[PDB]
């Protein structure tokens, strides 16, 4: 199918730059207009940019006018955001999308998230979460695994490496404090934990940091 | 300058009903070409926006004909006829018939579904965390409907409000529930001072709060 899959997102200091990229395959890319439209954390949709078949001519939301320039290599297939003096307001999921002229946002990239601020990145302490004595349930035990203290954003949580995925609640991460938290629950019946093992695998790509934590019995 | 308007924030509807949502300009969208560039977009949980709607009218190729928009001028409306639990998201209008293009602010698309009562588990912090100094106490809130719970903590009977963070799923399409966790972070030093923790959660399927609790000195 259309495909885009965009790079460069991460962490930036504020006033600093950083050149996002899009690359797109199976369709004539340099036949369409292309965008960049940004989710904010709190999940507003904003147009950023656009650039035409060509190139020659190009479009920006006001707030980013003269700060950001959209630019494409057709005959590689990629489309470029260099981003300046980059401000919290910044800090959104970034996708590119085609444009099909008047006809819409026809295909979108999965977005790359970029964050802009002054803390460090921090990888997370993944902390288990297992019932007390004897009232763990005793058929269907809820599990989870605590995710704290990371930044940047995204941390990717699976359990048992995906295999275990029904019963799972993977909860957003709250900010405070330039720290980001989650936390991942699963239930699984009495027969298969603890005599079967139950890990949690968290990913934090921005420390390259990968952890799997067992949860097991409390001591008791 | 040009607003997007949506109402609702928020549409519970069932399966096999029609839901409409509407999108209200505060300038006419018709272009200089006499034409309206008012499209309908949705995002479904964890994933892109998706394009349903171009010209006011037209579904994009792929799109269910059970999704349709009408409208002019300044309103715009985009009617699901028979609704199914994959229609569950956030629904966007957007607008380029006149620059600066503009998204409106999103309607969650909600499904409605038989009140469930949580499912709630209490956990006590690690020993690993207690051992780097921190303390944080957990309860899970599972698999409930509708989305609007009040989660009280009480420490020793003192019902306390600082320290304690609520996070929602999206709706699960599998079971049209929520959850939520309710975390409440203590210093190790604040935590070891006191025995009794309790979360208490009111949900409307039940007169009585459903409570967890647990004494730091058990298990
Ligand atoms: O560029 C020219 O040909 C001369 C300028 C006037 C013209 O004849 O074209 C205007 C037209 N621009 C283009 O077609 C260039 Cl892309 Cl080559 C126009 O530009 P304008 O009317 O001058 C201003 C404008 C800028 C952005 C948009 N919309 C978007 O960028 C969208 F958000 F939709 F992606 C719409 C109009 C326009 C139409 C559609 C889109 N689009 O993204 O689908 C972009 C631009």
């Known amino acids: 199918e259309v495909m885009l899959v965009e790079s460069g997102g991460g962490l930036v200091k504020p006033g600093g730059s950083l050149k996002l990229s899009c690359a797109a395959s199976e369709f004539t890319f340099s036949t369409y207009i292309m965008s960049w439209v940004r989710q904010t954390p709190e999940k507003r949709l904003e147009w950023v940019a656009t650039?035409?078949?060509?190139?020659?001519?190009?479009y920006y939301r006001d707030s980013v006018k003269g700060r950001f320039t959209v630019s494409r290599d057709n005959a590689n297939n990629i489309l470029y955001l260099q981003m300046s003096s980059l401000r919290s307001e910044d800090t959104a999921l970034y996708y590119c999308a085609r444009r099909d002229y008047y006809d819409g946002f026809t295909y979108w990239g999965q977005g790359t998230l970029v964050t802009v601020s002054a803390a460090k990145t921090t990888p997370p302490s993944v902390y288990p979460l297992a019932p007390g004595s004897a009232a763990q349930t005793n058929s269907m035990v809820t599990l989870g695994c605590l995710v704290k203290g990371y930044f940047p954003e995204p941390v990717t949580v699976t359990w048992n490496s995906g295999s275990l995925s029904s019963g799972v609640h993977t909860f957003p991460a709250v900010l405070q404090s330039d720290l980001y938290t989650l936390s991942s629950s699963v239930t699984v019946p009495s027969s298969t934990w603890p005599s079967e093992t139950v890990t949690c695998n968290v990913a934090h790509p921005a420390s390259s940091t990968k952890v799997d934590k067992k949860i097991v019995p409390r001591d008791c | 300058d040009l607003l997007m308007a949506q109402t609702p924030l928020s549409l519970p509807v069932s399966l096999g009903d029609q839901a409409s949502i509407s999108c209200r300009s505060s300038?006419?969208?018709?272009?200089?070409?006499?034409?309206?560039?008012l499209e309908w977009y949705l995002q479904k949980p964890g994933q892109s926006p998706k394009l349903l709607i171009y010209?006011?009218?037209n579904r994009f190729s792929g799109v269910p004909d059970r999704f349709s928009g009408s409208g002019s001028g300044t309103d715009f409306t985009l009617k699901i006829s028979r609704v199914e639990a994959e229609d569950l998201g956030v629904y966007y209008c957007?607008?380029?018939?006149?620059?600066?293009?503009?998204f409106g602010g999103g309607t969650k698309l909600e499904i409605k579904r038989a009140d469930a009562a949580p499912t709630v588990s209490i956990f006590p912090p690690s020993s690993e965390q207690l051992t780097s100094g921190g303390a944080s106490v957990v309860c899970f809130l599972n698999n409930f409907y509708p989305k609007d719970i009040n989660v009280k903590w009480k420490i020793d009977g003192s019902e306390r409000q600082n320290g304690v963070l609520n996070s929602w799923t999206d709706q699960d399409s599998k079971d049209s529930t929520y959850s939520m966790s309710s975390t409440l972070t203590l210093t190790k030093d604040e935590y070891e001072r006191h025995n009794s923790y309790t979360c208490e959660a009111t949900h409307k399927t039940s007169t009585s709060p459903i409570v967890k609790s647990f004494n730091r000195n058990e298990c």
């Open positions: 010209k006011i009218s």
């Open positions: 957007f607008q380029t018939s006149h620059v600066p293009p503009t």
């Open positions: 650039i035409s078949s060509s190139g020659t001519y190009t």
């Open positions: 300038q006419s969208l018709v272009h200089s070409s006499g034409n309206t560039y």
